[PDB]
C-alpha cells in the first residue's frame, strides 16, 4: 500500500482509518538513559505498534503496521514476533509472504531476525524449493555473509539437500580460493555425506588441498583445512606427508608450511617415534624461527610450544631427579 | 537512521 | 639503541609483514591489501609528518562521548532501540575502565530504567514494553552489577529470571535466544553469565549445554554459532565463557582452540580478525584476545608447566599498538578499523580489549605492559563476564546470601 519512503508517505497520527486508536508514547521514564531522539517517522510508526501490541489488535491495519515497523528497525524482535502472530492468526498467504522475507533479507542481510523468519516459513511450508537459489543469490553479494551459509546448513540438512552441494563448493573455491566460509561448508558437505575415513575421499582431499595450496602457499584456509581432515587421526599416522611438505620448502614455504611441520614433529613426539630427539630438535629450530624471525606475531605461542616439547620430550623429560 | 552495512551485529 | 624503534609496528622489519599474495589475486586479498595500505599510512604518518610517535589514550574525548551518550542518543541509534540494556552496559563499562565514577544520580535512573525492561514473565527486553531476550538479559545485569548497589541488585527479579531461562531451554542442551526465536551459542553464554552472577542455577539447568557447545567446537580449532558453522571469535568467546563458567572447559580440544585463536591475530595490522581470512576489526581485540585469559586459566588448572608467568599467549604489544593507533576517533569513541565511524559497542570492547593486552594476571604473579603514555593504563577486566573483576566477586558474594530460587 504505502511504502515508508513513498514521497506521499503519511505519518500514521495522520491517518483516517487510524483515528480510532490512541497511540501509546514510549515509556522511558521521569529521568531517560540512553534515550535515543528518534525521528519523527519513527516515534510515530512505534507509539502506534505500541497501542496495536498492547490491545493485541489482530488485524489487517496491524499487519501493515509491522511491515513498517520492521522497514525503521528490522532488529527489532518483538515486532517480528506479533508478524508472526497476525500471519496465523489472519490466515495470511505464507508464499506472499515469503517474496516479502526475500526482499528484506535482500536490503538487510546481515541481520538475525530476517532469517530466523525465513527459517519459521520454511518450515511452516515444509517446503525448501527456493531456498538454495536464494541463498546462492545473496552469497553472490557477500560471499562469506555467516547467517546465509548458516541457514544454508540448515536448510541443506534438514531437507537433505546434499546432491549438488560440493559442486556449489567447487563453484565458489574458484572463484575465491582464500574464501574460509566455503572450505567450512566443503567440510560439512563431506563430513555428512561421505565422511573422511574412506581412504579413497581422505585422499582425493589431500591432493586437492595439496594443490591448492601449491596454487597459492600463503592461503591460510587451504592449510587450516589440510590439518582440520587429518589430525584427528594423528599427523603422524601419515609418514608421506612430512617428506611431502618438506618438498615445498624452497619455492613454497610460508610460516604455514613452518607451522604445520611443528605440528607433525609434535604428533611424531606424542606417538614415540624413531630418534626421539632427532625430531624434538628440529621442532625447537623450527619453533624458534617462528618466534624470531617467520612468525613474531605468535612469538608468546611459539615460545610456548618450545616449551611444552621440550618439558615432555626432551632425553631428561623421564629421567628421574637423582640419575 | 537505518543500520549501517558498514558496522557489526551481535543480536 | 638510537636507531632501535620501541614501536612494533613501525619497525623496518614489520614491512615484511605485508600480505602475500602469490599473484594470485581474489576478492580476499583485495579487500586484505585495501586494510593494509590504509593501515600502513596510519604508521608511516609521524615518519612522513617528521615528528616522534606518541601514543595517548584520548581519555577525556571518550570520557565526553561516553557521559553524553548515558543520556541521550541521536537518530542514529534508532537501529539500537531494541538493544537499549547493550548502550547501558557498553556505556557504564567503558566509564568503569576508564575509571571514572558513576554517580548515584546516573546509577539510580539507570536501575528504574533497566526496571521497565524487565518483563513481567522475567529476563529484559531491549527496551520498556519489548519481549524479554536473552543479549539484552545478559546486558542489563551486567549494567546493574557494574553500578553494584543494593538498588541495583535488587532490581532482577531472581524468580522470573530462572523461569524465563526454563521457557527458553532446549532438549538438545541449547537455548533459544527468545521466545519463538534463534539458537546459537550466545544464548549459552548469555544465559550462564546471567545465573551463575545471580546465583539461580539449579542442578539440571544446564543439563546438556556443555555437550551442546562442544558439539560448535569444529574443524578449525574455534567454535562456531551452531555445530557445523565456521569457527567465529564472537562465539568461540561465547562457547569457552560459557564452559569456563561451566567448569567444563576440558569438554573441548583446547590444544587445537588456542592454535586457532593465536592464528587470528593479524601479523601486519596488529589487531585480530573475527575468523580466518576475513579483516580485522578493534571489538576481536576482546572477544578473540579475551579467549587467551581463558585458555591460561585452563591449561593451568591442568596443571601446564609451560605455561608463561607473565604475558598472555597473544602479542599484548601490537594489539596495543593496533587499538591505540587506529581505533580511536579524534572527537572521542573508538571503532572497527581506519575508514569506519565511532560507536559505543566499539568503544566498549575496544578498551575491554586494550585493558586485557595490559594486564597479565595468573595467581598472586601480575606482570602489566602499557604502550605509550603511562596514563593510559585502564581498569582490570573479568574475562569471563567482562565486567570489573571487584564488580564479579562483589555480585557473586551478594547473591550467594539469596537462596537458588525454590531452594
Ligand atoms: C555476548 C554476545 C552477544 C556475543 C556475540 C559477539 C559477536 C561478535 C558475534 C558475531 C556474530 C556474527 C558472526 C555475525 C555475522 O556478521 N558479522 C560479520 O560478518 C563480521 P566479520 O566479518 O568480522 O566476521
Ligand atoms: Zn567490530
Redesign the pocket.
Known sequence: FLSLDSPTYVLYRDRAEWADIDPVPQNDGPSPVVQIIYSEKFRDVYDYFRAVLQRDERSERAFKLTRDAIELNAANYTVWHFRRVLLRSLQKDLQEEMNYIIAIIEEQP?NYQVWHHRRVLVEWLKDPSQELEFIADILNQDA????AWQHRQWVIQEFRLWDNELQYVDQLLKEDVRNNSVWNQRHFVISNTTGYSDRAVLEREVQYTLEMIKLVPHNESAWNYLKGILQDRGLSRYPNLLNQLLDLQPSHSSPYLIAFLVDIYEDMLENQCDNKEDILNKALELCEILAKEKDTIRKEYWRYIGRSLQSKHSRESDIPASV | KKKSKTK???? | PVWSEPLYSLRPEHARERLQDDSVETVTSIEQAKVEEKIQEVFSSYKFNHLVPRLVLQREKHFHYLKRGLRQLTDAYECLDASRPWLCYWILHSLELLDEPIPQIVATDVCQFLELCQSPDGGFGGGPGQYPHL?PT?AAVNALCIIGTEEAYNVINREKLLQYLYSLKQPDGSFLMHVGGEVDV?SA??AASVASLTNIITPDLFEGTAEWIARCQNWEGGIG?VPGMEA????T??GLAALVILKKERSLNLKSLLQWVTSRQMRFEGGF???CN??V?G??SF?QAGLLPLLHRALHAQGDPALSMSHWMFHQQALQEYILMCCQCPAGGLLDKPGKSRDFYHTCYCLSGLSIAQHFGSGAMLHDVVMGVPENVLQPTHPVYNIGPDKVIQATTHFLQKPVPGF
Open positions: 546481515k562469506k555473509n555467516y547467517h | 557489526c551485529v551481535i543480536m | 543479549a545478559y550466545r553464554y548469555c554459532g567465529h571469535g564472537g562465539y568467546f561465547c580478525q573475527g575468523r576475513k579483516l576489526d571489538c576481536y572477544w
